[PDB]
From a paper:
Attempts to address this question have been confounded by the fact that [name] exists as a dimer in solution, but given the changes in [name] oligomerization required for its interaction with SecYEG, it is not clear whether the solution dimer is related to oligomeric species that may participate in the translocation reaction. In the current work, we have discovered that the formation of the [name]-[name] tetramer is completely dependent on unstructured polypeptide segments at its N- and C-termini.
To obtain a structure of the [name] PPXD, we used a deletion construct, “[name]-[name]” that lacks the C-terminal domains, including the Helical Wing Domain (HWD), the Helical Scaffold Domain (HSD), and a linker connected to the Zinc Binding Domain (ZBD). In addition, entropy-reducing mutations to alanine37 were introduced in two areas, one containing E55, K56, and E58, and a second at E196 and E197. The structure of [name]-[name]∆NC bound to Mg2+-ADP contains the DEAD Motor domains, NBD1 and NBD2, in the same conformation observed for other [name] structures, with the exception of the [name] [name] structure which was crystallized in the absence of bound nucleotide and in which NBD1 and NBD2 adopt a more open conformation. The β-hairpin anchoring the PPXD to NBD1 is in a fully extended conformation that has not been observed in previous crystal structures, where the hairpin is typically bent to facilitate interaction of the PPXD with the C-terminal helical domains. The core PPXD structures are conserved throughout, with some differences in loop regions. Helix 4 is particularly well-conserved, likely because it plays a central role, interacting directly with SecYEG as well as Helix 1, 3, and Hairpin 2. That is, [name]-[name]∆NC, in which both N- and C-termini had been truncated to remove unstructured polypeptide but is otherwise identical to [name]-[name], is completely monomeric when analyzed by gel filtration chromatography.
Residue numbers in the entry: 15 to 590
The structure:
Amino acid sequence: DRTLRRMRKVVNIINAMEPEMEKLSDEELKGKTAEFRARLAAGAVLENLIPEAFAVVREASKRVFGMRHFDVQLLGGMVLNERCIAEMRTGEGKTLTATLPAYLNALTGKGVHVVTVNDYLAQRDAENNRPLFEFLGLTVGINLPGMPAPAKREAYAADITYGTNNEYGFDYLRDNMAFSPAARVQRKLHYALVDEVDSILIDEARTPLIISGPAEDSSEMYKRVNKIIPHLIRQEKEDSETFQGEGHFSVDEKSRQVNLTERGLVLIEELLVKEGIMDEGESLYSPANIMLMHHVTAALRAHALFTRDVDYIVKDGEVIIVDEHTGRTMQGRRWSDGLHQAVEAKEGVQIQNENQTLASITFQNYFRLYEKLAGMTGTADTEAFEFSSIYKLDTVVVPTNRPMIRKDLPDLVYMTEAEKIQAIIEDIKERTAKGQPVLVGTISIEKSELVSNELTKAGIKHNVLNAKFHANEAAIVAQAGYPAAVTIATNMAGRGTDIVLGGSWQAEVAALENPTAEQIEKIKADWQVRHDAVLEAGGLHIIGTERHESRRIDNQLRGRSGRQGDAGSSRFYLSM
Ligand SMILES: Nc1ncnc2c1ncn2[C@@H]1O[C@H](COP(=O)(O)OP(=O)(O)O)[C@@H](O)[C@H]1O
Ligand SMILES: [Mg+2]
């Protein structure tokens, strides 16, 4: 690869500038953003400033985080500034790496969109990265579902923004429906730096974002027409040859249907016309005005055939149905032909127009809108062809910082699921006994629960991450490399949270309240022994309970082991 060779020369140069950066004060270092922007206003192009800008970020990260960008992270940063994907293995530091191109592009003053995969990660990377960006004179926004338009607009106004693919695309659709540009929230789609880019740009590429709403706004007919039914009096039978009534409508409890007598049609017609929904002399069976017939026949049914606390209930301002078994109440179900609306309208609660698609976009089309697009992932090379053909993104495999020595053992076949699950359990117990921790990836909650319950029978304490409380599960995952830890996770659970061998001592320190030097030195000295032992015991061991249809997904699982040169192993189990 010739591209890596050109970029190595810049890495060395950036390295050559470190001594001069170390002399700058925190204020001289902070002024760098303004010195760069003046250059840009006086003839510089962004690419000229790449060395200098990266060296400023690195040295800033030294002082703020205690983290000096590795050479390979400098390489990935340069990739990310071109229209490319940087494949950087799990735990190669993609979050810190992204600060290089995000700093560089934010100088342009047009904003930067960092995309992660879920809301917990967007806020985490923003807040983790925020001290480095504020140290350098930049602001950092966080776009989250449920934020009001002013707050979102402030987050898009910041130098750099974080958010999920869903909420960025939802903002754009909502922006396309604005009546003038003033209501919008986004600026121009300038730079989209997409974390976990195979999840986002490939797996969700074709899945569309949809905003549903009503255009058939026919509530005033429902509400107003409802006013007429209280005026109608009920009678026991239809006005037959043998029977006569003094009322406006009847009812078939047996056949569950409503019949209207001629005087009611008079009065309804009178009242329909009267309030201002009809005309004099109009036939209400008239093909001309037959919307009302459905309005009235639904309204009439709503009062006549359906009764509250019997067929439905009115909790939380939603008309809810009740199953004939009287057992339960559905929460998504509605009623056809305007029946629910009339029923809702009779109770007065929340008239529900029909909802339809009002705006739609695929992430494919969406992320193609940005002027600059880039992406990082631990697993991209296999998808290189659609990255190029769909987005014109080129992929670049980035050397790991240290040598990758994880041992991906051969798969194992068994005749039946029972046997596979007994063999995994036997292997868990074995590796626990030695102190080695084990992460068990599944591809479904169903398979997580089955495995969990076999681990329980076997007396094996373990944790189950189902990807429903990302922040909580993130806290469990960070300890999953504790000696003899046992964690179950579906492919979607706890991704993006480093699993440190021996546990994360960071977590331990926060647990204590105002610790002291030798208390913390206690944690640190204890953790090192844990880490040396776990590393000695083979590190983290991955068990795949089955292989995904897409091998890349299995590759993401095993990648959770073997970070930054650590020992580790993985193994997938198969059966019929
Ligand atoms: N240059 C660095 N020096 C020290 N630690 C780093 C550096 N870069 C990243 N880290 C640490 O590595 C851990 C994993 O980084 P992360 O961004 O989660 O990896 P990835 O997203 O690439 O899988 C984090 O705890 C982070 O603080
Ligand atoms: Mg990550």
